[PDB]
Amino acid sequence: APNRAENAYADYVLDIGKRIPLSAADLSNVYESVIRAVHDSRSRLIDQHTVDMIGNTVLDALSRSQTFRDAVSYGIHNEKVHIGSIKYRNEYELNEESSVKIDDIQSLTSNELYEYDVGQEPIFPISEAGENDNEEPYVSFSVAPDTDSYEMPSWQEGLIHEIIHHVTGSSDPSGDSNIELGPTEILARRVAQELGWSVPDFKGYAEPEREAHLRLRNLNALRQAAMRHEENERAFFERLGTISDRYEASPDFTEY
């Protein structure tokens, strides 16, 4: 097998994954497990909108992307993460290059998402496929942007990307490349294409235009989420802080 960080790993995963397809019954079980896993992720997600969007995105990919099904099937049959085991989080971190006057995410205000100097916004999402100490896998990712937002398809594609790390064991390029996507992003882009998610045609995982697109997508998703909860702004930033501190927030979003 190719190394998990080389582009070749993508087509390898799919070739092997296609050998044992998911029956409509297998798919049905996967489907229900994802519904459960996403619902169980409420306590680490910023809002119900984000819960809904994660579920919709993953289920739509299972329903309409052969590539995603092939990747998911690969993991089930080849000792990677079974997609139904993955839970979801919206962890953020302070931007250490920033200017903004805050000790913690809990004290942040919506004004501070606009009024800061340079390109140093106060916080960034943590976007990663990790596991907790009981080896239970999770994806941390940006809060969901608004329905019908410019940011939605890129957000969806990036979410699928992190899931691909778990379900296929793929990695990103070892070096910062402007001409190689890496096998995880290759697969995520194929899923996006099959689903009609409009994303920019980047060639390199770390190319400056991609990095800029991501930061701006994340900042706007955060601004949009904060605005959705303008009525309960302090509760919104406290919840984001609670999640980022790795504690459980209300699974029923009672602060809203």
CA–CA dist 1, 14 (Å, integer):
12
- Whichever of 89 and 223 has its CB closer to Zn ion, that residue is 89
CB 238 → Zn ion: shortest distance, Å? 29
Among residues 205, 143, 135, the alpha carbon closest in space to that of 166 is found at 135
- Whichever of 179 and 227 has its CB closer to Zn ion, that residue is 179
Strands 137-140 and 128-131: antiparallel
Packing angle, helices 233-244 and 208-228, rounded to 10 = 130
CA–CA dist 45, 204 (Å, integer):
30
Residue 165, marked binder:
yes
CB 152 → Zn ion: shortest distance, Å? 19
Residue 172, marked binder:
yes
Give residues in contact with Zn ion (CB under 5 A).
172, 184
Q: Which residue is nearest to Zn ion (CB)?
A: 172
- Whichever of 18 and 210 has its CB closer to Zn ion, that residue is 210
DSSP 186: H
CA–CA dist 6, 186 (Å, integer):
10
CA–CA dist 18, 21 (Å, integer):
6
- Whichever of 40 and 128 has its CB closer to Zn ion, that residue is 128
The single residue listed with the structure tokens 């998610």 is 197
CB 140 → Zn ion: shortest distance, Å? 12
CB 126 → Zn ion: shortest distance, Å? 12
Residue 104, marked binder:
no
Q: Which residues make up each annotated binding site for Zn(2+)?
A: 161, 165, 172
Q: Which residues make up each annotated binding site?
A: 161, 165, 172
